[PDB]
Design a protein around this ligand. Structure first.
Ligand SMILES: Nc1ncnc2c1ncn2[C@@H]1O[C@H](COP(=O)(O)OP(=O)(O)OP(=O)(O)O)[C@@H](O)[C@H]1O
Ligand SMILES: Nc1ncnc2c1ncn2[C@@H]1O[C@H](COP(=O)(O)OP(=O)(O)OP(=O)(O)O)[C@@H](O)[C@H]1O
Ligand SMILES: [Mg+2]
Ligand SMILES: [Mg+2]
Ligand SMILES: [Zn+2]
Ligand SMILES: [Zn+2]
Lengths: 643, 49, 651
DNA sequence: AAAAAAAAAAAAAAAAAAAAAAAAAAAAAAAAAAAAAAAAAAAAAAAAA
């Protein structure tokens, strides 16, 4: 229907004279600069934002979104033609593929014969000599689609979907152009690969071996060939977009090139790409017809909404965030912003913020002490333990939420599972691995299987998982902080029994928890009325009642916490005696009493990492005495409910 | 014709076996209808021409 | 050989008959309206009741039920003509308009067991349960290619030869130009329709007991694909056909048969009800005319065969109506589902209340204490075993999403199962994970459970804690707990025995004529239509042997179903007077000194009790169709909670 | 002028090679499916104050 020479001129015109004031208001050619950067081989990926294209040619954006594979090819053609005139120096040949490109180009010039018309097969395939790769960023005027509803009517179209990443293969080399050499001639043979399989060539087709009518067997080699970083992921529907009685649907996303190594399993992502078929020929197909599988050829992969990425590299922000972080009540404001719909539990929220920020990991002369804070909320029924855990799951960047026994066994640990790219046995992690450097919220901790409690022992202290079962012999790597929620021994605290007889945790597991918080709800008229007013306001308006400080948005909380995270403070010597005295005093009162939990050196280490976290929240580089004071006070408030 | 007793220990799903088939030629499209099939576990070799 | 049919007399007559049946404008234009309606909401399949066709043209009806593809292609030509007449632009926007079939199939109503070879090429109705769905695959129906060498663009069409002879020239995908120039396919310009194969098994409760099940393969084409999922009880209407084998040279004479669906439908209990304008007028009249005591009128009319348990019936109405889910901006969730537990003496009609809600409520799932075990109750994770991948399997409480799980003998359920349902009973979701897959399935259900106390019978002289053998964590998420007690009072016995004996004497009018026995046996079911997928409604029941006579009527079951469906959608908003009353009420409930001595707590009072005060008040307001939660609603909620949460211990 | 000749010169029949056309044409191997059974890990219910 349409003429692609004119479309190529259109996309050339867009690339050459589109400008924006992004550089601090200075008017830059957004894509000409990148053509410069990738003509000098300083850049590989060119993300063509289609919002930019739509500013001056919405019909082009419609055509792109309707074919989306013709236009990716057109854009690659156009940029490849524009690169020579944007090259202002000579590339340093940073790579080994670059040497092959340079030798091929130089040989082609050397035997040029510019006026002689060479065969269509006597040329280098375009894909063999590109070194860049071009991707679309979907127009924002396209509303994201739901994985279930991306069907045959959108094959070939550019669509945007979002879901949880459930499974990512390892990055492995996918052949793009298979290069062969001959045993007779000295020409190279190229076989661009489009299918998932290919039959390697046997005889060479070069001009010399045809003239000579020689054998000319050709040999497949990796050295001149083109591979691309390839990776296959499975992405899954979000829970709040599944039909009522249904399970979430998956989609295969084929990720190649510079989009690899972005998504990890557990990530919430938005993927823009072309919905494309794979011919699926070969089977003993029941039905006649050209049936095919489907996949999303990823163009843009964006983590989001709990695993947001770009803010991390954008730590520089407004003067405001400077002024709130500088404020003295910043710690109180961040603590209050944790689940504002839950009323009360101010100190619990302070401790939870400490778990999110965490302490500093020590590595002294090969004896690792982990800076993770593990917290257990040992509480009465209906005191909002699960709500706090679910909130912390929605907040923390790498967080997995686990209730009683749905995620038991290999749902926490790893399992060996078959792959598809290589058909061998890959290792897949469970909740403790999917939360490797984040939080794992274990709800109903007390009703957990004993094997899983043992695994949690070894995770909490050594921060690994040792498996020596039949198919698996590995030490997984689980650097997570455990946020546990449990009920006392008989579902409710019994003041007639002893504290550890209510906790029903062994001393070893009880010591694994830096802060173990008792939450009792004794009735009382004033506090019950206040709690009821808060709850009824939340029901009435879907928001917490207004207070003096507006709670921070969960994006701001993530950014503030992440900005705190890279702030390793050191305990000074001037605090050594103060900390030691606090620990000794705490230790003495532990056995002076008859209603105290197990206390050990881990209690000191808990003081020390809690105070390090508190110092970190103030963005200081040394721990002060107020941090140690706040750590001590939180440690007493953990059991304050007993009084 | 035999008469034997016994107990039945498996019964397959009921399926479809042709008694008459029709075959069509791929080029001239002419048909060779109502070819009678032998009853029982006996097959049929299509005409090669 | 390529010929065209200059004149097919049969095709002409068929198309004329079908267009005549569809025009319908003189005969109260039902299909006229149906076609304009599918044009309106942008569909392209018309569901045609074969009873209407049998009325208008019986000869077509027989021909269509017996020669399915010929008649269906004629009828789809006629339908495209009709759509083009009504709207030519919409008609050109779709290549094909399909006709699905509906209604009563006499002997063409089968199960996967009775679907035999005497039905090949006939339209059949098959009922069963989905055992496996395939992936939804696109099948190319029109491939567009571009030759960069010559700038030419070609297109190649592929007819649906699924059940017809396919010659190998029919399925060649063009890769080269005639000059052997490489073609490249235009994926966004090519046309693909999506394709899916399911397997329908005979329903386990319909199959002969002890025999292995029988299945049928079913083909689903575009817009019919995602209509069923494994474990669904569906009704599939389609053509029964013998699939072509692969070009051989020797054939064994065996053909794979398959059902090519022309319509798929779910259990009609779970479908959106049809609402005639008179029905909406009647609902508005009901709600507006009787507003103070409408809730009690609906409640006492709930399970008419069960005498008494009026508070239990009010609570069950609240469960059927539900609170309103809160969806906070930060993603936090508060449930609007009401969970009810009945503990009682033997034979106090609590299994009967569970069964009534099973009959009445949409998406109600049964279960007994040990009939479901964890994985069978919540979801499961299995491995596909043919692709090597993890697969999620929905259990009872996922299938009951936006529905009810009616758990009976809840006490005899194992402890691990109740631990498993803790998370569903509050968060309305099932968190499940093996290592290759993790998911958070939606299970937004309300649990109605029946249990027996420890020792089988309730002990009046023991604390309800010592008598209900459940812990405060499990009890507290049951937001209403009713001790249904067998008191052997003689006047109560008068009342109950009278009611029961009166229910054991009633004959259904007309159907029963004096001595009839109801049963039918394994053929009579397929003889008539299924009252599970089947397509003037009064308001009050007429007086009969159910009741003697009085000045208070009985809401009809059908009207109550329609009314509850309408009222369930309402989202009454809590007012400030209601909020203050509920807050102070809850604060008073928590403080024990307000409640007498010798009166124990059946279940603990927590913040969940406040949430359930709100939920019950909201459900009451829904019943009145208020759009606001007024003080009467809050009072009814508080009195229900007050009745449920305390029991008098005797001595 | 006609009378023998003595060729064309047309036909029927033959040959007589070409050069093109026409006519013959199942059985052996494989794979996939669906079903089994088996080593291992994992999840249940009987034990006692
Ligand atoms: N302090 C509170 N503020 C706001 N809401 C609360 C509070 N306490 C309880 N709730 C409400 O009560 C409901 C139950 O809370 P949740 O399920 O978190 O209890 P839980 O601590 O998990 O109890 P269990 O130990 O039984 O699991 C939630 O909807 C929550 O909103
Ligand atoms: N109040 C009542 N009104 C009408 N029928 C009743 C009443 N009480 C008992 N029945 C009759 O008793 C019979 C048994 O009732 P059901 O099976 O529901 O008892 P149950 O409470 O479930 O007993 P269990 O607790 O032992 O399971 C039913 O057929 C029911 O009709
Ligand atoms: Mg909980
Ligand atoms: Mg019962
Ligand atoms: Zn060669
Ligand atoms: Zn032929």
């Amino acid at each position: 229907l349409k003429d692609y020479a004119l479309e190529k001129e259109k996309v050339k015109k867009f690339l050459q004279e589109f400008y924006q004031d992004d550089e601090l208001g200075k008017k830059q050619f957004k894509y000409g600069n990148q053509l410069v950067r990738l003509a000098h081989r300083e850049q590989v990926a060119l993300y063509v934002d289609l919002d930019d294209v739509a500013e001056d040619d919405p019909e082009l954006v419609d055509s792109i979104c309707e074919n989306a594979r013709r236009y990716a090819k057109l854009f690659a053609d156009a940029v490849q033609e524009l690169l020579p005139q944007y090259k202002e120096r000579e590339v340093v040949n940073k790579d080994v593929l670059d040497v092959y490109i340079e030798h091929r180009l130089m040989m082609e010039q050397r035997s040029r014969d510019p006026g002689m018309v060479r065969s269509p097969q006597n040329q280098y395939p375009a894909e063999l000599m590109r070194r860049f790769e071009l991707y679309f960023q979907g127009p924002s005027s396209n509303k994201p689609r739901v994985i279930r509803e991306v069907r045959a009517d959108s094959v070939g179209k550019l669509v945007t979907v979002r879901g949880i990443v459930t499974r990512v293969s390892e990055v492995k080399p996918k052949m793009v152009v298979a290069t062969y050499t001959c045993d007779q001639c000295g020409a190279e043979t190229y076989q661009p690969i489009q299918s998932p399989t290919f039959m390697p060539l046997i005889m060479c087709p070069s001009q010399e071996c045809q003239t000579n009518r020689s054998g000319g067997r050709l040999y497949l080699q990796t050295r001149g060939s083109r591979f691309i970083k390839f990776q296959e992921m499975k992405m899954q529907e979000h829970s709040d977009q599944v039909p009522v009685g249904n399970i979430p649907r998956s989609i295969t996303v084929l990720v190649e090139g510079e989009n690899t190594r972005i998504a990890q399993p557990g990530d919430h992502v938005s993927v823009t790409g072309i919905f494309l078929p794979i011919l699926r020929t070969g089977f003993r197909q029941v039905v006649q017809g050209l049936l095919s599988e489907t996949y999303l050829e990823a163009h843009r992969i964006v983590k989001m909404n709990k695993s947001e990425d770009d803010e991390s590299g954008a730590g520089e922000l407004t003067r405001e965030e400077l002024r709130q972080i500088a404020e003295e009540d910043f710690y109180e404001k961040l603590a209050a912003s944790i689940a504002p719909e839950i009323y009360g539990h101010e100190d619990v929220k302070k401790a939870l913020l400490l778990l999110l920020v965490g302490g500093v990991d020590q590595s002294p002369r090969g004896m690792k002490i982990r800076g993770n804070i593990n917290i257990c909320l040992m509480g009465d029924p209906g005191v909002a333990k699960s709500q706090l855990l679910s909130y912390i799951d929605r907040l923390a960047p790498r967080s997995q939420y686990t209730t009683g026994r749905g995620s038991s066994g290999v749902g926490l640990t790893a399992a060996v599972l078959r792959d598809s790219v290589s058909g061998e046995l890959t290792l897949e992690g469970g909740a403790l691995v999917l939360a490797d450097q984040g939080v794992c919220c274990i709800d109903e901790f007390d009703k957990m299987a004993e094997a899983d409690r043992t695994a949690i022992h070894e995770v909490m202290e050594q921060q690994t998982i040792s498996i020596a079962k039949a198919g698996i012999l590995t030490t997984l790597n689980a650097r997570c902080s455990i946020l546990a929620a449990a009920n006392p021994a008989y579902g409710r605290y019994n003041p007639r029994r002893s504290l550890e007889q209510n906790i029903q945790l062994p001393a070893a597991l009880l010591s694994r928890f830096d802060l173990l918080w008792l939450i009792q709800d004794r009735p009382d008229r004033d506090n019950d009325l206040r709690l009821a007013q808060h709850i009824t306001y939340v029901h009435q308006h879907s928001r917490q009642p207004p207070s003096q400080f507006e709670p921070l948005d969960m994006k701001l909380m993530r950014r503030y916490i992440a900005m705190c995270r890279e702030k390793q403070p050191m305990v000074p010597e001037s605090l050594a005696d103060y900390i030691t005295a606090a620990y000794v005093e705490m230790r003495r009162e532990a056995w002076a009493s008859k209603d105290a939990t197990y206390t050990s050196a881990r209690t000191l280490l808990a003081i020390l990492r809690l105070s390090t976290a508190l110092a970190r929240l103030r963005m200081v580089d040394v721990v002060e005495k107020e941090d140690v004071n706040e750590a001590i006070r939180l440690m007493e408030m953990s059991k304050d409910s007993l009084l | 014709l035999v008469k034997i007793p016994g107990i039945i220990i498996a019964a397959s799903a009921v399926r479809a076996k042709a008694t008459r088939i029709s075959i069509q030629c791929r080029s001239c499209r002419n048909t060779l209808t109502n070819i009678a099939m032998r009853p029982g576990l006996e097959g049929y070799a299509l005409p090669r021409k | 050989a390529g010929t065209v049919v200059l004149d097919d007399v049969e095709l002409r007559e068929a198309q004329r008959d079908y267009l005549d049946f569809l025009d319908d404008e003189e005969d109260q234009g039902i299909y006229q309206s149906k076609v304009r309606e599918l044009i309106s909401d942008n569909q392209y399949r018309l569901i045609v009741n074969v009873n209407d066709l049998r009325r208008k043209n019986e000869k077509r009806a027989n021909r269509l039920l017996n020669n399915a593809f010929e008649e269906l292609v004629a009828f789809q030509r006629a339908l495209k003509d009709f759509v083009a007449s009504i709207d030519a632009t919409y008609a050109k926007q779709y290549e094909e308009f399909y006709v699905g079939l509906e209604g009563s199939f006499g002997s063409k109503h089968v199960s996967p067991r009775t679907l035999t070879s005497c039905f090949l090429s006939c339209v059949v109705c098959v009922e069963g349960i989905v055992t496996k769905c395939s992936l939804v695959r696109p099948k190319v129906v029109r491939s567009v290619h571009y030759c960069p060498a010559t700038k030419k663009t070609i297109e190649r069409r592929y007819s649906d030869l699924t059940t017809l002879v396919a010659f190998p020239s029919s399925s060649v995908y063009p890769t080269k130009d005639e000059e052997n120039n490489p073609l490249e396919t235009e994926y966004g310009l090519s046309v693909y329709k999506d394709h899916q194969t399911i397997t329908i098994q005979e329903m386990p409760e319909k199959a002969p007991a002890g025999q292995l099940p029988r299945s049928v393969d079913v083909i689903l084409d575009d817009d019919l694909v995602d209509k069923a999922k494994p474990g669904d009880r569906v009704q599939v209407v389609g053509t029964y056909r013998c699939l072509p084998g692969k070009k051989g040279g020797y054939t064994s004479g065996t053909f794979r048969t398959v059902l090519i669906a022309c319509n798929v439908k779910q259990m009609s209990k779970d479908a959106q009800p049809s609402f005639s304008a008179e029905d909406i007028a009647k609902i508005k009249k009901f709600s507006k005319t009787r507003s103070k005591d409408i809730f009690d009128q609906l409640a006492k009319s709930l399970a008419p065969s069960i005498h008494g348990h009026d508070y239990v019936k009010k609570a069950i109405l609240c469960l059927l109506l539900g609170g309103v889910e809160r969806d906070l901006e930060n993603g936090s969730h508060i449930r609007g589902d009401i969970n009810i537990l009945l503990i009682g003496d033997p034979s106090v009609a609590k299994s009967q209340l569970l069964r009534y809600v099973l009959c009445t409520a949409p998406r109600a799932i049964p279960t007994t204490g040990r009939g479901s075990s964890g994985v069978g109750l919540t979801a499961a994770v299995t491995t596909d075993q043919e692709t090597g991948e993890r697969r999620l399997e929905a259990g009872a409480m996922v299938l009951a999403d936006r529905g009810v799980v009616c758990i009976d003998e809840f006490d005899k359920m194992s402890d691990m199962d109740r631990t498993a349902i803790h998370e569903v009973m509050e968060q309305g979701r099932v968190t499940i994970a093996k290592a290759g897959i993790h998911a958070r399935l939606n299970a937004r259900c309300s649990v109605l459970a029946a249990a027996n106390p420890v020792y089988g019978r309730y002990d009046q002289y023991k604390t309800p804690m010592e008598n209900i053998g459940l812990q405060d964590s499990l009890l507290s998420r049951f937001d209403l707990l009713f001790i249904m007690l067998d008191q052997m009072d003689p006047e109560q016995d008068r009342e109950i025995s009278d009611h029961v004996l009166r229910m054991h004497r009633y004959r259904a009018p007309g159907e029963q004529d004096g001595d009839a026995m109801p049963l039918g046996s394994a053929v009579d079911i397929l003889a008539t239509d299924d009252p599970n997928f089947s397509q003037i409604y009064e308001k009050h029941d007429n007086l009969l042997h159910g009741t003697k006579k009085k000045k208070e009527k009985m809401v009809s079951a059908a009207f109550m179903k329609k009314y509850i469906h309408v009222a369930k959608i309402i989202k009454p908003v809590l007012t400030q007077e209601s909020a203050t009353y509920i807050a102070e009420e809850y604060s008073r409930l928590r403080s024990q000194d307000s409640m007498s001595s010798d009166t124990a707590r059946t279940s603990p009072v927590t913040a969940r009790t406040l949430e359930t005060l709100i939920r019950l008040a909201t459900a009451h307001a829904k019943a009145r169709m208020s759009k606001t939660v007024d003080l009467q609603d809050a009072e009814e909620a508080v009195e229900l909670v007050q009745y449920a949460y305390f029991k008098k211990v005797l001595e």
